[PDB]
Amino acid sequence: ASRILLNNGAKMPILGLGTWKSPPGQVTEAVKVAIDVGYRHIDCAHVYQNENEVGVAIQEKLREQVVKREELFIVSKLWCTYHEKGLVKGACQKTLSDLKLDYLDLYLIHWPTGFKPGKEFFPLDESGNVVPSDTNILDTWAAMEELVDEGLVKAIGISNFNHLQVEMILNKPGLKYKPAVNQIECHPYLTQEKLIQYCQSKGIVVTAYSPLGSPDRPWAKPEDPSLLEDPRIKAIAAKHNKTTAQVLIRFPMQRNLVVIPKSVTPERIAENFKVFDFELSSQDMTTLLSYNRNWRVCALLSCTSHKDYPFHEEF
Ligand SMILES: NC(=O)c1ccc[n+]([C@@H]2O[C@H](COP(=O)([O-])OP(=O)(O)OC[C@H]3O[C@@H](n4cnc5c(N)ncnc54)[C@H](OP(=O)(O)O)[C@@H]3O)[C@@H](O)[C@H]2O)c1
Numbered sequence: 385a386s387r388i389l390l391n392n393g394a395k396m397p398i399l400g401l402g403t404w405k406s407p408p409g410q411v412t413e414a415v416k417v418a419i420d421v422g423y424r425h426i427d428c429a430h431v432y433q434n435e436n437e438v439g440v441a442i443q444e445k446l447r448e449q450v451v452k453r454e455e456l457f458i459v460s461k462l463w464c465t466y467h468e469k470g471l472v473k474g475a476c477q478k479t480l481s482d483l484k485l486d487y488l489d490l491y492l493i494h495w496p497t498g499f500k501p502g503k504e505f506f507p508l509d510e511s512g513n514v515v516p517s518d519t520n521i522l523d524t525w526a527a528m529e530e531l532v533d534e535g536l537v538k539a540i541g542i543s544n545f546n547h548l549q550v551e552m553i554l555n556k557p558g559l560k561y562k563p564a565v566n567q568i569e570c571h572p573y574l575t576q577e578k579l580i581q582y583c584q585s586k587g588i589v590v591t592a593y594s595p596l597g598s599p600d601r602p603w604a605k606p607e608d609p610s611l612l613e614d615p616r617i618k619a620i621a622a623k624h625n626k627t628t629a630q631v632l633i634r635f636p637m638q639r640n641l642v643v644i645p646k647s648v649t650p651e652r653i654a655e656n657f658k659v660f661d662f663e664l665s666s667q668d669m670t671t672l673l674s675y676n677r678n679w680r681v682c683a684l685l686s687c688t689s690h691k692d693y694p695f696h697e698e699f
């Protein structure tokens with residue numbers, strides 16, 4: 385099926401459009417094209433600085449009656465500088481205002497690490513270390529739970545939480561709502577078997593980000609691995625008469641993951657959606673899993689001393 389049941393009883397489309405790095409000038413048309421060709425899930429964040437322009441598209445398509453709001457699954461995320469309890473509602477309300485929505489389908493704690501509040505997204509000390517906030521993830525979660533109880537969001541979740549962090553939420557004293565989703569980096573170079581099996585065993589749906597290896601990440605280097613140019617992946621695509629990107633989006637779908645490829649290129653937006661008409665074989669799946677190398681796109685150096693940095697640990 386094209387949608388997966390979450391623990392809040394709502395259904396989530398397993399293919400969504402990513403919006404990180406989509407320039408503000410091109411993301412409105414990008415989202416329009418996406419909705420036009422089938423996408424019903426959009427992955428957003430305040431930190432991406434383009435939620436206004438995303439919302440312009442959603443609103444035009446709602447006004448145009450191309451789609452109904454109930455048919456849309458719009459995801460945003462709470463940025464690290466707003467983990468304080470007094471700041472969570474306003475952060476969510478800013479996002480809703482910019483997206484031109486009265487609710488989000490899903491609102492994630494974006495990273496487990498809280499940073500000092502201020503106008504700066506990445507407040508640093510004079511030596512380049514991120515300035516933490518003394519907020520912890522459990523209190524941030526109570527704040528997220530309040531958003532459900534106020535009708536601003538239909539589901540809450542986390543993002544970039546390791547197994548021990550997930551476990552801390554599930555084991556939170558007085559837990560009122562379990563997390564619906566954990567959104568983590570996942571592709572054939574970072575396969576996450578252990579963390580995914582842990583989350584799924586607990587009824588937490590996993591969304592895979594950077595499924596193409598985020599070739600437009602601004603810190604990419606010549607010697608980094610490249611998924612889209614991996615001849616072993618290209619061969620698998622050739623076998624199926626599909627593109628390499630199509631294989632890389634179908635791969636997580638078959639692991640019962642949600643996947644959110646980003647493009648602002650209309651022909652790639654459409655290509656990326658044409659992944660429901662073919663199957664990878666079990667052997668194809670194990671073969672792609674074998675390319676794991678624990679290679680991470682998203683793991684900023686300046687953040688490695690935060691007490692709650694999620695990637696020292698095994699998973
Ligand atoms: N939770 C978090 O911490 C977190 C972190 C990272 C990402 N995410 C979410 O996940 C989304 C996807 O990850 P991502 O943006 O890092 O990268 P991605 O989706 O792995 O890669 C996007 C890059 O691939 C290109 N591309 C897309 N389709 C292609 C195709 N069919 N053939 C060739 N190239 C193609 C895009 O180019 P064009 O755009 O020029 O077409 C862009 O350069 C984000 O945008 C964001 O919504 C969340």
Ligand SMILES: O=C(O)Cc1nn(Cc2nc3cc(C(F)(F)F)ccc3s2)c(=O)c2ccccc12
Nearest residue numbers: 404431432495496497682683684687690693694
């Ligand atoms: O955030 C996205 O969606 C994409 C994303 N990733 N990264 C790499 C990051 N690595 C982190 C590591 C931690 C850590 F938790 F590990 F400390 C905390 C926060 C971050 S941001 C960025 O620096 C970034 C900057 C602007 C907009 C989006 C991003």
